[PDB]
Automatic annotation (TrEMBL):
Keywords: Metal-binding, Signal, Zinc. Pfam families: NPP1 (PF05630). This is Necrosis-and ethylene-inducing protein. It comes from the Eukaryota. InterPro entries: NPP1. Disulfide bonds join 34-60. GO terms for molecular function: metal ion binding.
Length: 212
């Protein structure tokens, strides 16, 4: 059965995003803190995360571990692509912060044109809403997001950016398999972090990210 595993030993999920999910994956620029890590493996092991002491990016800056998740939904007339990233800790300063970090972004597409009608990005419990993003905030089909510490909200958060970002290996909800979905769905694996694609949170990510 799946067990906890060291954050730097858990194997990533292979790429399983659909062509549409891959097309619209936001770029993610790490302004500060951790790079993204695998929260789970194909066998349903889950990351033990990191204690939020030491430097905010210590032990979580290995780019070979990068992962993104996506769960698709069709929602009130739009295709909604709910992306998520896991960082092993969410630390503002040594001892201030949390083990685990789950971030999310919802890309809403027009039913017909598959044009981006809007993107929303997680800001610890709230969704920032970007109707009709463009210009310096999009590169072709990839909206550009920055991850950074936001001490006023006691957490890291996502915002739209003009800086180029990474596109880590993209595992879809549907492609990752049952054991990995179970391991993300188990909310008690994640302390104070909340995976916005888990079964218990997908509905509120959708209604929360809605901007029409
Ligand atoms: Na580009
Ligand atoms: Zn905490």
């Amino acid at each position: 059965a799946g067990t906890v595993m060291d954050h730097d030993k858990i194997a990533k999920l292979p790429a399983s995003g659909s062509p549409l999910e891959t097309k619209f994956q936001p770029q993610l620029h790490i302004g500060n803190g951790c790079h993204s890590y695998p929260a789970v493996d194909a066998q349903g092991n889950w990351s033990g995360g990191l204690k939020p002491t030491g430097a905010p990016s210590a032990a979580c800056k290995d780019t070979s571990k990068a992962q993104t998740y996506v769960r698709s939904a069709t929602f009130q007339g739009k295709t909604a692509l709910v992306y998520a990233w896991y960082m092993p800790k969410d630390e503002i300063s040594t001892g201030i912060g949390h083990r685990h970090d789950w971030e999310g972004a919802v890309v809403f597409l027009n039913s017909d044109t598959q044009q981006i009608d809007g993107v929303a990005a997680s800001a610890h419990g709230k969704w920032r809403k970007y109707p009709n993003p463009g210009g310096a905030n999009i590169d072709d089909t990839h909206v550009k997001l920055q991850y950074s510490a936001e001490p006023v909200i006691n957490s890291h958060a996502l915002d739209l950016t003009d800086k180029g970002g990474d596109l880590p290996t993209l595992a879809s909800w549907e492609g990752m398999g049952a054991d990995a979905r179970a391991a993300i769905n188990e909310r008690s694996h994640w302390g104070d972090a909340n995976p916005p694609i888990a079964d218990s949170l997908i509905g509120s990510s959708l209604s929360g990210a809605w901007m029409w």
